[PDB]
Amino acid sequence: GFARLKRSLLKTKENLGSGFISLFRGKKIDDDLFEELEEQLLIADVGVETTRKIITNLTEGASRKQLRDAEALYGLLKEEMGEILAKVDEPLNVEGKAPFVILMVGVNGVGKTTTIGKLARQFEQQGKSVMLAAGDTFRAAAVEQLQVWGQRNNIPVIAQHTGADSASVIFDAIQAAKARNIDVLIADTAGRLQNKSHLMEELKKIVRVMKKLDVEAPHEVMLTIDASTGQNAVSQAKLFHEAVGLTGITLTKLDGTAKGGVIFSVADQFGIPIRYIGVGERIEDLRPFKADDFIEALFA
Amino acid sequence: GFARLKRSLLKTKENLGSGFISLFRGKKIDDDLFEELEEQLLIADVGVETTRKIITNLTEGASRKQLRDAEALYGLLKEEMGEILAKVDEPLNVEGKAPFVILMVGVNGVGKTTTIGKLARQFEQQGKSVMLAAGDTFRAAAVEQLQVWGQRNNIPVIAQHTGADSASVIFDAIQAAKARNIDVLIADTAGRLQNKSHLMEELKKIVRVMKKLDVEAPHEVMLTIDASTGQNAVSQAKLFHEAVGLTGITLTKLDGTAKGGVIFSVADQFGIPIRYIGVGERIEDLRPFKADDFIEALFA
Ligand SMILES: COc1cc(Br)c(OC)cc1N
Ligand SMILES: COc1cc(Br)c(OC)cc1N
Ligand SMILES: COc1cc(Br)c(OC)cc1N
Numbered sequence: 208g209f210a211r212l213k214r215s216l217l218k219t220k221e222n223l224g225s226g227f228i229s230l231f232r233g234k235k236i237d238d239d240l241f242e243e244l245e246e247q248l249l250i251a252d253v254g255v256e257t258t259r260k261i262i263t264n265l266t267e268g269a270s271r272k273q274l275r276d277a278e279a280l281y282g283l284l285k286e287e288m289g290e291i292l293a294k295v296d297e298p299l300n301v302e303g304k305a306p307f308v309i310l311m312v313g314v315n316g317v318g319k320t321t322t323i324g325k326l327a328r329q330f331e332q333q334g335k336s337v338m339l340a341a342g343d344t345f346r347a348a349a350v351e352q353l354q355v356w357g358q359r360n361n362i363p364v365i366a367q368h369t370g371a372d373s374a375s376v377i378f379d380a381i382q383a384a385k386a387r388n389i390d391v392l393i394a395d396t397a398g399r400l401q402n403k404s405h406l407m408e409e410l411k412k413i414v415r416v417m418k419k420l421d422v423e424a425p426h427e428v429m430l431t432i433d434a435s436t437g438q439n440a441v442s443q444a445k446l447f448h449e450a451v452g453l454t455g456i457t458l459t460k461l462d463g464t465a466k467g468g469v470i471f472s473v474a475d476q477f478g479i480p481i482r483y484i485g486v487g488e489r490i491e492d493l494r495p496f497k498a499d500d501f502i503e504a505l506f507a
Numbered sequence: 508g509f510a511r512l513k514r515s516l517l518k519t520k521e522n523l524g525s526g527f528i529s530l531f532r533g534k535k536i537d538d539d540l541f542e543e544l545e546e547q548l549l550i551a552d553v554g555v556e557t558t559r560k561i562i563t564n565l566t567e568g569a570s571r572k573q574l575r576d577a578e579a580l581y582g583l584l585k586e587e588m589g590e591i592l593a594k595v596d597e598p599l600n601v602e603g604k605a606p607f608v609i610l611m612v613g614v615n616g617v618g619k620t621t622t623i624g625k626l627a628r629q630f631e632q633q634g635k636s637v638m639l640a641a642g643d644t645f646r647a648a649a650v651e652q653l654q655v656w657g658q659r660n661n662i663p664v665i666a667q668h669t670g671a672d673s674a675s676v677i678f679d680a681i682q683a684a685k686a687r688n689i690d691v692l693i694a695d696t697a698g699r700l701q702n703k704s705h706l707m708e709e710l711k712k713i714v715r716v717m718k719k720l721d722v723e724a725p726h727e728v729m730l731t732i733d734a735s736t737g738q739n740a741v742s743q744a745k746l747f748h749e750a751v752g753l754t755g756i757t758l759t760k761l762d763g764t765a766k767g768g769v770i771f772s773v774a775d776q777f778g779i780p781i782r783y784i785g786v787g788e789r790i791e792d793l794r795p796f797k798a799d800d801f802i803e804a805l806f807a
């Protein structure tokens with residue numbers, strides 16, 4: 208089963224899941240084996256600390272039950288790693304708000320705006336009215352692209368002049384969304400990395416200005432990260448988390464990359480729900496994260 | 508490809524998958540709507556019990572998620588029905604046997620022999636050696652047809668005189684297949700409906716004689732049914748599963764029919780893996796069943 212998901216994770220299945228099989232066949236459970244396993248986990252971008260946790264738990268349980276063959280570790284791994292993803296398997300519920308406000312954060316070039324469009328189309332297909340806020344105010348090309356997309360897809364896009372104050376754009380966007388009975392407002396933000404502090408202060412200002420119109424907003428702080436950036440995805444995650452406090456994560460480009468294992472780091476180091484995973488070019492390829500499906504396709 | 512699949516499933520998409528869209532547009536989630544949906548599912552030959560399961564799960568999920576608009580039901584349906592197919596998405600692996608024995612069961616006039624030829628051609632295209640056994644010994648026309656096909660395609664066909672013992676023909680075919688290093692042996696059988704008892708007992712005899720040469724044979728018991736026969740396809744399945752013990756199902760003629768929903772019944776009532784679906788006249792149109800691809804082409 209899960210043919211399409213397996214196809215997305217093939218390069219990730221090189222090292223994780225079924226990739227363990229060739230590593231365990233006809234081996235004895237000893238320090239050599241745990242070393243090779245640690246190495247294969249690190250290669251998959253699982254991270255030093257997360258790999259340390261997995262190797263430690265596996266070693267202690269194995270030695271306690273004195274498993275004889277290395278093949279028997281496979282199942283244990285499937286459990287351990289599975290548990291990790293299970294702790295971030297909370298889908299996003301955007302119902303019952305006028306509007307439900309999603310603040311989209313992350314650097315540029317990781318599929319953030321693509322995620323905005325896909326989520327917009329999904330929400331509209333679910334019978335909801337969507338509005339966008341072009342809060343990336345200093346990149347005229349990005350804003351105009353978002354506006355042309357809105358015009359082609361009949362979704363309103365709030366924008367201001369190049370160089371406008373993002374918090375003002377998003378403020379006006381919330382006002383217009385409440386006035387027009389919008390169900391979901393998705394607010395884009397600047398994704399420049401240069402000047403970490405400034406971008407952080409800018410996001411905090413956007414939030415504080417949000418609280419003038421609705422203290423519950425933003426209802427979702429969604430970070431977008433790219434799996435094919437390996438451990439960079441981890442750093443970025445921490446960067447934004449310290450500054451605004453994330454509530455959801457979208458992990459894109461899981462297909463066509465061997466760095467998929469980064470998910471286990473992201474899930475383990477932060478425990479923030481992974482709302483969606485991007486496993487293809489289609490709108491439906493931005494899928495709600497289901498930990499069990501992911502594990503089964505990985506370890507098959 | 509995917510596009511050709513969607514086009515093949517257009518006539519079934521009238522009522523199922525995307526066919527739900529017009530039914531949910533601008534409607535309120537109430538008993539009237541669930542009644543219209545239940546009716547549309549039954550008309551599509553989804554089956555009474557399976558339709559009840561879908562309607563119940565959909566309703567409970569709706570109330571649990573406090574969905575407002577009927578459009579939002581679409582996704583849940585796509586999941587529900589998808590789950591049904593996901594539980595029978597184990598593809599057929601015919602590797603590593605000398606030969607892998609496929610016992611082809613089913614009635615006549617449902618594409619059984621056509622499926623035999625297509626599977627033979629595919630396996631041969633994959634680099635495997637194929638042999639056929641004309642176990643439908645009492646229909647001289649069928650045997651002669653299978654033989655002329657095998658000679659036209661240079662594939663050996665084991666046969667005996669009209670009225671020979673099918674179990675003997677298949678016995679000789681397994682012996683010769685083991686002797687010639689054949690990878691896959693496909694054995695046809697009688698598909699007469701009159702007097703089930705005779706045919707069923709005949710299949711148990713064929714199996715018992717098979718196990719004299721290879722206790723693992725038959726490695727696959729493949730039922731062939733015709734989707735365009737609606738609930739007849741269900742009955743036949745019930746007939747054969749109780750009688751011989753199936754391990755795979757091929758559903759032919761999914762193109763050009765509005766009764767495609769029968770697949771969801773077959774998957775739900777029996778839980779036997781659906782190995783292939785026939786969506787066209789070409790050799791490649793007998794596709795290995797991928798539940799996710801099928802769902803995506805049906806919906807959206
Ligand atoms: C070209 O297609 C898009 C353009 C933009 Br801009 C986007 O962000 C809303 C999403 C998509 N899919
Ligand atoms: C100048 O960026 C802002 C825009 C609005 Br609107 C606001 O709320 C009055 C506060 C700030 N800082
Ligand atoms: C390739 O599937 C076939 C198998 C037989 Br046997 C046949 O009889 C001539 C026709 C077809 N298409």
Ligand SMILES: COc1cc(Br)c(OC)cc1N
Nearest residue numbers: 672674675678679712716719
């Ligand atoms: C008459 O059907 C059979 C054919 C063979 Br061959 C066999 O092996 C001795 C047993 C039986 N019953």
Ligand SMILES: [N+]
Nearest residue numbers: 236269270273
């Ligand atoms: N051990």
Ligand SMILES: [N+]
Nearest residue numbers: 305306421424
């Ligand atoms: N809001």
Ligand SMILES: [N+]
Nearest residue numbers: 313314431443
């Ligand atoms: N990011």
Ligand SMILES: [N+]
Nearest residue numbers: 316317318319
């Ligand atoms: N991007």
Ligand SMILES: [N+]
Nearest residue numbers: 357361362363
């Ligand atoms: N619009």
Ligand SMILES: [N+]
Nearest residue numbers: 364365366367
């Ligand atoms: N605007």
Ligand SMILES: [N+]
Nearest residue numbers: 341344366367
């Ligand atoms: N803007």
Ligand SMILES: [N+]
Nearest residue numbers: 382383385386
């Ligand atoms: N407003």
Ligand SMILES: [N+]
Nearest residue numbers: 432433436440
């Ligand atoms: N990233």
Ligand SMILES: [N+]
Nearest residue numbers: 508509510511
């Ligand atoms: N195609």
Ligand SMILES: [N+]
Nearest residue numbers: 334532533578
């Ligand atoms: N609608």
Ligand SMILES: [N+]
Nearest residue numbers: 611612729731
């Ligand atoms: N069959």
Ligand SMILES: [N+]
Nearest residue numbers: 612613696697
């Ligand atoms: N049969």
Ligand SMILES: [N+]
Nearest residue numbers: 628631632633
């Ligand atoms: N071929």
Ligand SMILES: [N+]
Nearest residue numbers: 641642643695
């Ligand atoms: N036959």
